[PDB]
Amino acid sequence: SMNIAVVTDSTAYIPKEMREQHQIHMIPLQVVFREETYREEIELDWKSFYEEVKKHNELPTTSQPPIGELVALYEELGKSYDAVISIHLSSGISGTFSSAAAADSMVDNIDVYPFDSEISCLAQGFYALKAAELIKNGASSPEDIIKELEEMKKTVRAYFMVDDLAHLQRGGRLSSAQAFIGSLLKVKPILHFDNKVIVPFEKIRTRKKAISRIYELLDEDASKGLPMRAAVIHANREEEAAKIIEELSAKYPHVEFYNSYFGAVIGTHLGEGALGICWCFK
Ligand SMILES: CCCCCCCCCCCCCCCC(=O)O
Ligand SMILES: [Br-]
Ligand SMILES: [Br-]
Ligand SMILES: [Br-]
Ligand SMILES: [Br-]
Ligand SMILES: [Br-]
Ligand SMILES: [Br-]
Ligand SMILES: [Br-]
């Protein structure tokens, strides 16, 4: 029956060729520099970001997409589609989600179904892949697709570490956590999402130990022998990510592994040297 489009914001970091394969449209968030503000992924790739930042001593900030651009995308989309699955980074770390919702009453020709992925990066990307796959196999209810995504959210996991805690501190997305701890985070932990916001998952002494702990955490799901997607995400640490994927994929042939990155908007908050691993059931 009805035609359903799929949208995600840039911070899902789905490779552009893969988005084309799967019919996934994308709305960029912004990275703000001293002179220029860019639309990430389209106007600034991840290597340029980390290169620009260190060779200009940039202290970038980020912005959600202008509500105007969301509306324009939906209006355009609505000429060929009845509904859009609009998938976004956590409502606890960005106003993007709530702008997608508010943009729905601003467009007549399409029904927007905002989905709070309560996460970001390729973990959020995974929801858009599932949505496209469902749509490809004749999913004709936007509601049924959303139900599907919410169930999948039950088993999506992500753990990550940063090199310098200062970037997160600066961007403000450790506020909730620190509001609950009652004080200031000084030592680097494993981080994860809990109730839509970033919080320490566990105290750890070294990055090496953090990775090994995350391996254990992955094994808990990877050991069931059920089909999975997983991504090792880096902020300018591609070789390190590749060694991890080399070792992990050998160990888990049933887990499809992606080498992915923190782009300009997310890397603005995590900082170069950040590393994480996420996964979910296919
Ligand atoms: C493999 C692990 C992936 C986990 C994803 C971590 C996301 C980093 C959180 C901080 C970024 C906040 C973005 C704010 C954008 C805006 O200004 O609205
Ligand atoms: Br792009
Ligand atoms: Br329409
Ligand atoms: Br509408
Ligand atoms: Br479905
Ligand atoms: Br630090
Ligand atoms: Br926060
Ligand atoms: Br660490």
PDB file of C-alpha atoms and ligand atoms in Angstrom:
ATOM      1  CA  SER A   1       0.000   0.000   0.000  1.00  0.00           C
ATOM      2  CA  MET A   2       1.734   3.172   1.246  1.00  0.00           C
ATOM      3  CA  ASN A   3       5.208   4.468   0.353  1.00  0.00           C
ATOM      4  CA  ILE A   4       7.556   5.012   3.259  1.00  0.00           C
ATOM      5  CA  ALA A   5      10.785   6.988   3.036  1.00  0.00           C
ATOM      6  CA  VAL A   6      13.653   6.629   5.512  1.00  0.00           C
ATOM      7  CA  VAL A   7      15.639   9.540   6.928  1.00  0.00           C
ATOM      8  CA  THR A   8      18.534   9.667   9.373  1.00  0.00           C
ATOM      9  CA  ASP A   9      20.730  12.554  10.491  1.00  0.00           C
ATOM     10  CA  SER A  10      24.399  12.757   9.543  1.00  0.00           C
ATOM     11  CA  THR A  11      25.639  11.474  12.925  1.00  0.00           C
ATOM     12  CA  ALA A  12      24.519   7.954  12.021  1.00  0.00           C
ATOM     13  CA  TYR A  13      27.650   7.980   9.791  1.00  0.00           C
ATOM     14  CA  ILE A  14      26.334   5.518   7.227  1.00  0.00           C
ATOM     15  CA  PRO A  15      28.689   5.544   4.224  1.00  0.00           C
ATOM     16  CA  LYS A  16      27.127   7.559   1.402  1.00  0.00           C
ATOM     17  CA  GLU A  17      27.322   4.637  -1.060  1.00  0.00           C
ATOM     18  CA  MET A  18      25.501   2.455   1.470  1.00  0.00           C
ATOM     19  CA  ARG A  19      22.801   5.069   1.958  1.00  0.00           C
ATOM     20  CA  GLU A  20      22.288   5.059  -1.811  1.00  0.00           C
ATOM     21  CA  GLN A  21      22.067   1.265  -1.810  1.00  0.00           C
ATOM     22  CA  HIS A  22      19.401   1.372   0.878  1.00  0.00           C
ATOM     23  CA  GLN A  23      17.425   4.462  -0.053  1.00  0.00           C
ATOM     24  CA  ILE A  24      18.361   6.362   3.071  1.00  0.00           C
ATOM     25  CA  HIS A  25      18.131  10.139   2.920  1.00  0.00           C
ATOM     26  CA  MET A  26      20.121  12.220   5.376  1.00  0.00           C
ATOM     27  CA  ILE A  27      19.945  15.593   7.089  1.00  0.00           C
ATOM     28  CA  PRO A  28      23.284  16.985   8.283  1.00  0.00           C
ATOM     29  CA  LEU A  29      24.143  18.503  11.612  1.00  0.00           C
ATOM     30  CA  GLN A  30      26.573  21.415  11.745  1.00  0.00           C
ATOM     31  CA  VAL A  31      30.136  21.827  12.962  1.00  0.00           C
ATOM     32  CA  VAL A  32      30.986  25.419  13.780  1.00  0.00           C
ATOM     33  CA  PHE A  33      34.498  26.816  13.387  1.00  0.00           C
ATOM     34  CA  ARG A  34      35.793  30.343  13.937  1.00  0.00           C
ATOM     35  CA  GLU A  35      35.144  31.524  10.386  1.00  0.00           C
ATOM     36  CA  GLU A  36      33.066  28.752   8.880  1.00  0.00           C
ATOM     37  CA  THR A  37      30.220  26.453   9.830  1.00  0.00           C
ATOM     38  CA  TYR A  38      29.965  23.186   7.831  1.00  0.00           C
ATOM     39  CA  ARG A  39      27.334  20.551   7.184  1.00  0.00           C
ATOM     40  CA  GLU A  40      29.186  17.426   8.292  1.00  0.00           C
ATOM     41  CA  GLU A  41      29.836  14.495   5.943  1.00  0.00           C
ATOM     42  CA  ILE A  42      28.652  16.499   2.947  1.00  0.00           C
ATOM     43  CA  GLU A  43      30.899  19.555   3.443  1.00  0.00           C
ATOM     44  CA  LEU A  44      33.454  18.117   5.902  1.00  0.00           C
ATOM     45  CA  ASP A  45      34.749  14.525   6.068  1.00  0.00           C
ATOM     46  CA  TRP A  46      36.255  13.029   9.231  1.00  0.00           C
ATOM     47  CA  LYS A  47      39.943  13.184   8.274  1.00  0.00           C
ATOM     48  CA  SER A  48      39.588  16.865   7.320  1.00  0.00           C
ATOM     49  CA  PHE A  49      37.861  17.516  10.613  1.00  0.00           C
ATOM     50  CA  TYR A  50      40.638  16.141  12.839  1.00  0.00           C
ATOM     51  CA  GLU A  51      43.233  17.697  10.543  1.00  0.00           C
ATOM     52  CA  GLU A  52      41.579  21.133  10.566  1.00  0.00           C
ATOM     53  CA  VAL A  53      41.156  21.073  14.344  1.00  0.00           C
ATOM     54  CA  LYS A  54      44.753  20.302  15.288  1.00  0.00           C
ATOM     55  CA  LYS A  55      46.294  22.535  12.640  1.00  0.00           C
ATOM     56  CA  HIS A  56      44.257  25.593  13.600  1.00  0.00           C
ATOM     57  CA  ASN A  57      43.738  24.985  17.305  1.00  0.00           C
ATOM     58  CA  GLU A  58      39.996  24.932  16.701  1.00  0.00           C
ATOM     59  CA  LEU A  59      37.527  24.563  19.549  1.00  0.00           C
ATOM     60  CA  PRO A  60      34.544  23.558  17.405  1.00  0.00           C
ATOM     61  CA  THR A  61      30.955  23.567  18.584  1.00  0.00           C
ATOM     62  CA  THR A  62      28.001  21.786  17.019  1.00  0.00           C
ATOM     63  CA  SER A  63      24.447  22.546  16.017  1.00  0.00           C
ATOM     64  CA  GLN A  64      21.352  20.548  15.119  1.00  0.00           C
ATOM     65  CA  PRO A  65      19.944  20.983  11.620  1.00  0.00           C
ATOM     66  CA  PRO A  66      17.938  24.176  11.048  1.00  0.00           C
ATOM     67  CA  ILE A  67      14.237  23.344  11.287  1.00  0.00           C
ATOM     68  CA  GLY A  68      13.962  24.930   7.854  1.00  0.00           C
ATOM     69  CA  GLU A  69      16.132  22.229   6.288  1.00  0.00           C
ATOM     70  CA  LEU A  70      14.179  19.418   7.921  1.00  0.00           C
ATOM     71  CA  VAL A  71      10.946  20.846   6.577  1.00  0.00           C
ATOM     72  CA  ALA A  72      12.389  21.242   3.069  1.00  0.00           C
ATOM     73  CA  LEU A  73      13.567  17.619   3.042  1.00  0.00           C
ATOM     74  CA  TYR A  74      10.175  16.321   4.187  1.00  0.00           C
ATOM     75  CA  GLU A  75       8.256  18.515   1.724  1.00  0.00           C
ATOM     76  CA  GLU A  76      10.446  17.229  -1.080  1.00  0.00           C
ATOM     77  CA  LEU A  77      10.180  13.644   0.144  1.00  0.00           C
ATOM     78  CA  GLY A  78       6.398  13.986   0.444  1.00  0.00           C
ATOM     79  CA  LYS A  79       5.980  14.385  -3.306  1.00  0.00           C
ATOM     80  CA  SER A  80       6.653  10.644  -3.665  1.00  0.00           C
ATOM     81  CA  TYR A  81       6.071   9.213  -0.186  1.00  0.00           C
ATOM     82  CA  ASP A  82       3.183   9.053   2.280  1.00  0.00           C
ATOM     83  CA  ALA A  83       5.357   8.672   5.381  1.00  0.00           C
ATOM     84  CA  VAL A  84       8.965   9.098   6.547  1.00  0.00           C
ATOM     85  CA  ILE A  85      10.725   7.085   9.201  1.00  0.00           C
ATOM     86  CA  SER A  86      12.972   9.810  10.612  1.00  0.00           C
ATOM     87  CA  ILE A  87      15.765   8.327  12.742  1.00  0.00           C
ATOM     88  CA  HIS A  88      17.915  10.475  15.018  1.00  0.00           C
ATOM     89  CA  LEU A  89      20.604  10.693  17.683  1.00  0.00           C
ATOM     90  CA  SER A  90      19.401  10.618  21.292  1.00  0.00           C
ATOM     91  CA  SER A  91      16.873  13.243  22.375  1.00  0.00           C
ATOM     92  CA  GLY A  92      19.043  13.567  25.508  1.00  0.00           C
ATOM     93  CA  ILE A  93      22.074  14.788  23.574  1.00  0.00           C
ATOM     94  CA  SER A  94      20.423  16.862  20.816  1.00  0.00           C
ATOM     95  CA  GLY A  95      17.249  18.788  19.979  1.00  0.00           C
ATOM     96  CA  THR A  96      17.295  17.189  16.501  1.00  0.00           C
ATOM     97  CA  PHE A  97      14.730  14.495  17.429  1.00  0.00           C
ATOM     98  CA  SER A  98      12.197  17.012  18.794  1.00  0.00           C
ATOM     99  CA  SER A  99      12.671  19.211  15.704  1.00  0.00           C
ATOM    100  CA  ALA A 100      11.747  16.272  13.482  1.00  0.00           C
ATOM    101  CA  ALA A 101       8.586  15.849  15.555  1.00  0.00           C
ATOM    102  CA  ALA A 102       7.786  19.577  15.440  1.00  0.00           C
ATOM    103  CA  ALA A 103       8.502  19.631  11.685  1.00  0.00           C
ATOM    104  CA  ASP A 104       5.644  17.182  11.153  1.00  0.00           C
ATOM    105  CA  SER A 105       2.971  19.787  11.805  1.00  0.00           C
ATOM    106  CA  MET A 106       4.785  22.045   9.361  1.00  0.00           C
ATOM    107  CA  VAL A 107       4.451  19.699   6.403  1.00  0.00           C
ATOM    108  CA  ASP A 108       1.132  18.731   4.813  1.00  0.00           C
ATOM    109  CA  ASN A 109       2.118  16.180   2.165  1.00  0.00           C
ATOM    110  CA  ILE A 110       3.883  13.587   4.357  1.00  0.00           C
ATOM    111  CA  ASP A 111       3.598  11.917   7.773  1.00  0.00           C
ATOM    112  CA  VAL A 112       6.802  12.094   9.815  1.00  0.00           C
ATOM    113  CA  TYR A 113       7.547   9.257  12.245  1.00  0.00           C
ATOM    114  CA  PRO A 114      10.416  10.528  14.411  1.00  0.00           C
ATOM    115  CA  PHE A 115      12.393   7.767  16.062  1.00  0.00           C
ATOM    116  CA  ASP A 116      14.633   8.446  19.042  1.00  0.00           C
ATOM    117  CA  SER A 117      17.534   6.022  18.636  1.00  0.00           C
ATOM    118  CA  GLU A 118      18.734   7.075  22.100  1.00  0.00           C
ATOM    119  CA  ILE A 119      22.244   6.736  20.711  1.00  0.00           C
ATOM    120  CA  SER A 120      24.334   7.944  17.778  1.00  0.00           C
ATOM    121  CA  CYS A 121      26.896   6.902  15.181  1.00  0.00           C
ATOM    122  CA  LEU A 122      26.590   3.587  13.324  1.00  0.00           C
ATOM    123  CA  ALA A 123      24.571   2.113  16.205  1.00  0.00           C
ATOM    124  CA  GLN A 124      21.950   4.666  15.139  1.00  0.00           C
ATOM    125  CA  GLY A 125      22.797   3.782  11.545  1.00  0.00           C
ATOM    126  CA  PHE A 126      21.707   0.204  12.261  1.00  0.00           C
ATOM    127  CA  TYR A 127      18.139   1.333  12.852  1.00  0.00           C
ATOM    128  CA  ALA A 128      18.036   2.956   9.396  1.00  0.00           C
ATOM    129  CA  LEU A 129      19.380  -0.212   7.748  1.00  0.00           C
ATOM    130  CA  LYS A 130      16.704  -2.298   9.489  1.00  0.00           C
ATOM    131  CA  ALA A 131      14.027   0.188   8.483  1.00  0.00           C
ATOM    132  CA  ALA A 132      15.145   0.072   4.845  1.00  0.00           C
ATOM    133  CA  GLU A 133      15.343  -3.707   4.907  1.00  0.00           C
ATOM    134  CA  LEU A 134      11.816  -3.930   6.323  1.00  0.00           C
ATOM    135  CA  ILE A 135      10.606  -1.536   3.673  1.00  0.00           C
ATOM    136  CA  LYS A 136      12.347  -3.552   0.961  1.00  0.00           C
ATOM    137  CA  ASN A 137      10.581  -6.737   2.082  1.00  0.00           C
ATOM    138  CA  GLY A 138       7.193  -5.050   1.848  1.00  0.00           C
ATOM    139  CA  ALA A 139       6.773  -3.478   5.265  1.00  0.00           C
ATOM    140  CA  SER A 140       3.803  -1.251   4.501  1.00  0.00           C
ATOM    141  CA  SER A 141       2.939   0.073   7.957  1.00  0.00           C
ATOM    142  CA  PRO A 142       5.097   2.870   9.402  1.00  0.00           C
ATOM    143  CA  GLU A 143       3.786   1.807  12.800  1.00  0.00           C
ATOM    144  CA  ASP A 144       4.896  -1.805  12.355  1.00  0.00           C
ATOM    145  CA  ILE A 145       8.359  -0.567  11.378  1.00  0.00           C
ATOM    146  CA  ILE A 146       8.554   1.601  14.524  1.00  0.00           C
ATOM    147  CA  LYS A 147       7.419  -1.341  16.676  1.00  0.00           C
ATOM    148  CA  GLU A 148      10.209  -3.325  15.052  1.00  0.00           C
ATOM    149  CA  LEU A 149      12.792  -0.646  15.829  1.00  0.00           C
ATOM    150  CA  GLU A 150      11.713  -0.295  19.462  1.00  0.00           C
ATOM    151  CA  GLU A 151      12.105  -4.055  19.950  1.00  0.00           C
ATOM    152  CA  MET A 152      15.543  -3.957  18.306  1.00  0.00           C
ATOM    153  CA  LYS A 153      16.497  -1.128  20.694  1.00  0.00           C
ATOM    154  CA  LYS A 154      16.226  -3.629  23.548  1.00  0.00           C
ATOM    155  CA  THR A 155      19.441  -5.345  22.494  1.00  0.00           C
ATOM    156  CA  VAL A 156      21.447  -2.554  20.880  1.00  0.00           C
ATOM    157  CA  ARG A 157      24.619  -1.955  22.948  1.00  0.00           C
ATOM    158  CA  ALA A 158      27.437   0.574  22.803  1.00  0.00           C
ATOM    159  CA  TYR A 159      30.510   1.197  24.962  1.00  0.00           C
ATOM    160  CA  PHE A 160      33.116   3.852  24.221  1.00  0.00           C
ATOM    161  CA  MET A 161      36.184   5.630  25.593  1.00  0.00           C
ATOM    162  CA  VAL A 162      37.765   9.021  24.975  1.00  0.00           C
ATOM    163  CA  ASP A 163      41.393  10.157  24.976  1.00  0.00           C
ATOM    164  CA  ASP A 164      40.747  13.436  26.736  1.00  0.00           C
ATOM    165  CA  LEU A 165      37.673  13.965  28.873  1.00  0.00           C
ATOM    166  CA  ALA A 166      37.901  17.693  28.148  1.00  0.00           C
ATOM    167  CA  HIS A 167      35.990  17.575  24.843  1.00  0.00           C
ATOM    168  CA  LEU A 168      32.911  15.975  26.405  1.00  0.00           C
ATOM    169  CA  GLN A 169      33.154  18.326  29.389  1.00  0.00           C
ATOM    170  CA  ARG A 170      33.243  21.255  26.980  1.00  0.00           C
ATOM    171  CA  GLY A 171      30.258  20.206  24.857  1.00  0.00           C
ATOM    172  CA  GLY A 172      28.029  19.707  27.899  1.00  0.00           C
ATOM    173  CA  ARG A 173      26.879  16.132  27.320  1.00  0.00           C
ATOM    174  CA  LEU A 174      28.351  14.915  30.589  1.00  0.00           C
ATOM    175  CA  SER A 175      26.112  17.354  32.506  1.00  0.00           C
ATOM    176  CA  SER A 176      23.378  14.874  33.437  1.00  0.00           C
ATOM    177  CA  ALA A 177      25.879  12.241  34.569  1.00  0.00           C
ATOM    178  CA  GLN A 178      27.802  14.778  36.645  1.00  0.00           C
ATOM    179  CA  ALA A 179      24.561  16.230  37.989  1.00  0.00           C
ATOM    180  CA  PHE A 180      23.807  12.724  39.303  1.00  0.00           C
ATOM    181  CA  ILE A 181      27.345  11.937  40.551  1.00  0.00           C
ATOM    182  CA  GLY A 182      27.124  15.265  42.384  1.00  0.00           C
ATOM    183  CA  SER A 183      30.562  16.314  41.151  1.00  0.00           C
ATOM    184  CA  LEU A 184      33.075  16.489  38.344  1.00  0.00           C
ATOM    185  CA  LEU A 185      34.347  13.520  36.327  1.00  0.00           C
ATOM    186  CA  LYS A 186      38.153  13.520  36.465  1.00  0.00           C
ATOM    187  CA  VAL A 187      39.102   9.964  35.556  1.00  0.00           C
ATOM    188  CA  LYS A 188      38.319   8.412  32.172  1.00  0.00           C
ATOM    189  CA  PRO A 189      35.795   5.544  32.343  1.00  0.00           C
ATOM    190  CA  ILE A 190      34.051   3.303  29.886  1.00  0.00           C
ATOM    191  CA  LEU A 191      31.040   5.347  28.763  1.00  0.00           C
ATOM    192  CA  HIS A 192      27.626   4.163  27.603  1.00  0.00           C
ATOM    193  CA  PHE A 193      24.093   5.465  27.155  1.00  0.00           C
ATOM    194  CA  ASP A 194      21.634   5.067  29.973  1.00  0.00           C
ATOM    195  CA  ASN A 195      18.205   6.670  29.780  1.00  0.00           C
ATOM    196  CA  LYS A 196      19.143   8.681  26.687  1.00  0.00           C
ATOM    197  CA  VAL A 197      22.212  10.376  28.170  1.00  0.00           C
ATOM    198  CA  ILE A 198      25.942   9.624  28.455  1.00  0.00           C
ATOM    199  CA  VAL A 199      27.082   8.179  31.801  1.00  0.00           C
ATOM    200  CA  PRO A 200      30.094   6.295  33.115  1.00  0.00           C
ATOM    201  CA  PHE A 201      29.558   2.576  32.675  1.00  0.00           C
ATOM    202  CA  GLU A 202      32.595   1.445  34.600  1.00  0.00           C
ATOM    203  CA  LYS A 203      35.866   2.660  36.096  1.00  0.00           C
ATOM    204  CA  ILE A 204      38.883   1.536  34.152  1.00  0.00           C
ATOM    205  CA  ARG A 205      42.613   2.165  34.497  1.00  0.00           C
ATOM    206  CA  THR A 206      43.784   1.985  30.876  1.00  0.00           C
ATOM    207  CA  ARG A 207      42.407   2.008  27.344  1.00  0.00           C
ATOM    208  CA  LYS A 208      43.817  -1.506  26.914  1.00  0.00           C
ATOM    209  CA  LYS A 209      41.720  -2.714  29.843  1.00  0.00           C
ATOM    210  CA  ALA A 210      38.658  -0.869  28.538  1.00  0.00           C
ATOM    211  CA  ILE A 211      38.875  -2.717  25.231  1.00  0.00           C
ATOM    212  CA  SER A 212      39.308  -6.073  26.937  1.00  0.00           C
ATOM    213  CA  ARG A 213      36.332  -5.402  29.196  1.00  0.00           C
ATOM    214  CA  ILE A 214      34.254  -4.442  26.122  1.00  0.00           C
ATOM    215  CA  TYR A 215      35.316  -7.745  24.503  1.00  0.00           C
ATOM    216  CA  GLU A 216      33.779  -9.583  27.480  1.00  0.00           C
ATOM    217  CA  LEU A 217      30.614  -7.497  27.126  1.00  0.00           C
ATOM    218  CA  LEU A 218      30.395  -8.344  23.421  1.00  0.00           C
ATOM    219  CA  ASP A 219      31.027 -12.045  24.044  1.00  0.00           C
ATOM    220  CA  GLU A 220      27.830 -12.105  26.173  1.00  0.00           C
ATOM    221  CA  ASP A 221      25.752 -11.535  23.037  1.00  0.00           C
ATOM    222  CA  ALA A 222      28.166 -12.798  20.360  1.00  0.00           C
ATOM    223  CA  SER A 223      28.234 -16.165  22.182  1.00  0.00           C
ATOM    224  CA  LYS A 224      24.574 -16.936  21.549  1.00  0.00           C
ATOM    225  CA  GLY A 225      25.568 -17.612  17.937  1.00  0.00           C
ATOM    226  CA  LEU A 226      22.777 -15.445  16.511  1.00  0.00           C
ATOM    227  CA  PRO A 227      23.305 -13.062  13.531  1.00  0.00           C
ATOM    228  CA  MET A 228      24.555  -9.605  14.484  1.00  0.00           C
ATOM    229  CA  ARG A 229      25.904  -6.304  13.273  1.00  0.00           C
ATOM    230  CA  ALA A 230      28.805  -4.667  15.075  1.00  0.00           C
ATOM    231  CA  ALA A 231      30.992  -1.635  14.534  1.00  0.00           C
ATOM    232  CA  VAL A 232      34.330  -0.526  15.829  1.00  0.00           C
ATOM    233  CA  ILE A 233      34.171   3.265  15.733  1.00  0.00           C
ATOM    234  CA  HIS A 234      37.290   5.459  15.880  1.00  0.00           C
ATOM    235  CA  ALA A 235      38.167   9.164  15.959  1.00  0.00           C
ATOM    236  CA  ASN A 236      41.245   9.145  13.683  1.00  0.00           C
ATOM    237  CA  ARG A 237      42.458   5.731  14.858  1.00  0.00           C
ATOM    238  CA  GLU A 238      41.664   3.658  11.795  1.00  0.00           C
ATOM    239  CA  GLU A 239      44.484   1.119  12.101  1.00  0.00           C
ATOM    240  CA  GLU A 240      43.616   0.441  15.744  1.00  0.00           C
ATOM    241  CA  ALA A 241      39.962  -0.101  14.760  1.00  0.00           C
ATOM    242  CA  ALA A 242      41.119  -2.400  11.949  1.00  0.00           C
ATOM    243  CA  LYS A 243      43.229  -4.561  14.257  1.00  0.00           C
ATOM    244  CA  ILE A 244      40.228  -4.940  16.574  1.00  0.00           C
ATOM    245  CA  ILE A 245      37.919  -5.881  13.682  1.00  0.00           C
ATOM    246  CA  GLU A 246      40.518  -8.322  12.318  1.00  0.00           C
ATOM    247  CA  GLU A 247      40.667 -10.071  15.704  1.00  0.00           C
ATOM    248  CA  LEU A 248      36.941  -9.823  16.526  1.00  0.00           C
ATOM    249  CA  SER A 249      35.558 -10.987  13.166  1.00  0.00           C
ATOM    250  CA  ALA A 250      37.818 -14.040  13.183  1.00  0.00           C
ATOM    251  CA  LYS A 251      36.285 -14.894  16.558  1.00  0.00           C
ATOM    252  CA  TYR A 252      32.718 -14.302  15.384  1.00  0.00           C
ATOM    253  CA  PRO A 253      32.015 -15.194  11.731  1.00  0.00           C
ATOM    254  CA  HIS A 254      28.283 -14.742  12.409  1.00  0.00           C
ATOM    255  CA  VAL A 255      28.854 -11.095  13.370  1.00  0.00           C
ATOM    256  CA  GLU A 256      29.016  -8.631  10.462  1.00  0.00           C
ATOM    257  CA  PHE A 257      31.642  -6.027  11.377  1.00  0.00           C
ATOM    258  CA  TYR A 258      31.833  -2.438  10.143  1.00  0.00           C
ATOM    259  CA  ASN A 259      34.822  -0.156  10.352  1.00  0.00           C
ATOM    260  CA  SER A 260      33.285   3.223  11.147  1.00  0.00           C
ATOM    261  CA  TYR A 261      34.250   6.617  12.572  1.00  0.00           C
ATOM    262  CA  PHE A 262      33.249   9.558  14.737  1.00  0.00           C
ATOM    263  CA  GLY A 263      32.630  12.367  12.221  1.00  0.00           C
ATOM    264  CA  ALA A 264      32.893  16.125  12.770  1.00  0.00           C
ATOM    265  CA  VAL A 265      29.781  16.566  14.931  1.00  0.00           C
ATOM    266  CA  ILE A 266      30.370  13.594  17.248  1.00  0.00           C
ATOM    267  CA  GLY A 267      34.171  13.879  17.204  1.00  0.00           C
ATOM    268  CA  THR A 268      33.701  17.486  18.293  1.00  0.00           C
ATOM    269  CA  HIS A 269      32.365  16.064  21.573  1.00  0.00           C
ATOM    270  CA  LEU A 270      34.468  12.894  21.953  1.00  0.00           C
ATOM    271  CA  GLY A 271      37.727  14.379  20.611  1.00  0.00           C
ATOM    272  CA  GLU A 272      40.404  12.686  18.537  1.00  0.00           C
ATOM    273  CA  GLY A 273      41.528   9.348  19.934  1.00  0.00           C
ATOM    274  CA  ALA A 274      38.029   8.297  20.957  1.00  0.00           C
ATOM    275  CA  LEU A 275      37.149   4.626  20.385  1.00  0.00           C
ATOM    276  CA  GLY A 276      34.026   2.534  20.780  1.00  0.00           C
ATOM    277  CA  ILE A 277      32.335  -0.713  19.868  1.00  0.00           C
ATOM    278  CA  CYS A 278      28.602  -1.191  19.381  1.00  0.00           C
ATOM    279  CA  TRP A 279      26.362  -4.054  18.274  1.00  0.00           C
ATOM    280  CA  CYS A 280      22.835  -5.420  17.870  1.00  0.00           C
ATOM    281  CA  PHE A 281      20.964  -8.480  16.611  1.00  0.00           C
ATOM    282  CA  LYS A 282      20.145  -8.601  12.878  1.00  0.00           C
TER     283      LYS A 282
HETATM  284  C1  LIG B   1      30.466   2.862  19.418  1.00  0.00           C
HETATM  285  C2  LIG B   1      29.807   3.867  20.353  1.00  0.00           C
HETATM  286  C3  LIG B   1      28.925   4.975  19.772  1.00  0.00           C
HETATM  287  C4  LIG B   1      28.373   5.962  20.800  1.00  0.00           C
HETATM  288  C5  LIG B   1      28.025   7.381  20.372  1.00  0.00           C
HETATM  289  C6  LIG B   1      28.569   8.512  21.228  1.00  0.00           C
HETATM  290  C7  LIG B   1      27.994   9.906  20.969  1.00  0.00           C
HETATM  291  C8  LIG B   1      28.719  11.113  21.561  1.00  0.00           C
HETATM  292  C9  LIG B   1      27.873  12.095  22.366  1.00  0.00           C
HETATM  293  C10 LIG B   1      28.138  13.595  22.266  1.00  0.00           C
HETATM  294  C11 LIG B   1      27.625  14.275  20.996  1.00  0.00           C
HETATM  295  C12 LIG B   1      26.479  15.274  21.115  1.00  0.00           C
HETATM  296  C13 LIG B   1      26.019  15.918  19.812  1.00  0.00           C
HETATM  297  C14 LIG B   1      25.259  17.241  19.859  1.00  0.00           C
HETATM  298  C15 LIG B   1      24.801  17.823  18.520  1.00  0.00           C
HETATM  299  C16 LIG B   1      23.999  19.119  18.546  1.00  0.00           C
HETATM  300  O1  LIG B   1      24.658  20.311  18.866  1.00  0.00           O
HETATM  301  O2  LIG B   1      22.816  19.081  18.622  1.00  0.00           O
HETATM  302 BR    BR B   2      27.354  12.562   2.278  1.00  0.00          BR
HETATM  303 BR    BR B   3       2.578  12.321  -0.060  1.00  0.00          BR
HETATM  304 BR    BR B   4       2.336  15.779   8.458  1.00  0.00          BR
HETATM  305 BR    BR B   5       7.260  -4.440   9.342  1.00  0.00          BR
HETATM  306 BR    BR B   6      40.967  13.262  30.547  1.00  0.00          BR
HETATM  307 BR    BR B   7      23.643  15.727  29.355  1.00  0.00          BR
HETATM  308 BR    BR B   8      40.025   4.915  28.406  1.00  0.00          BR
END
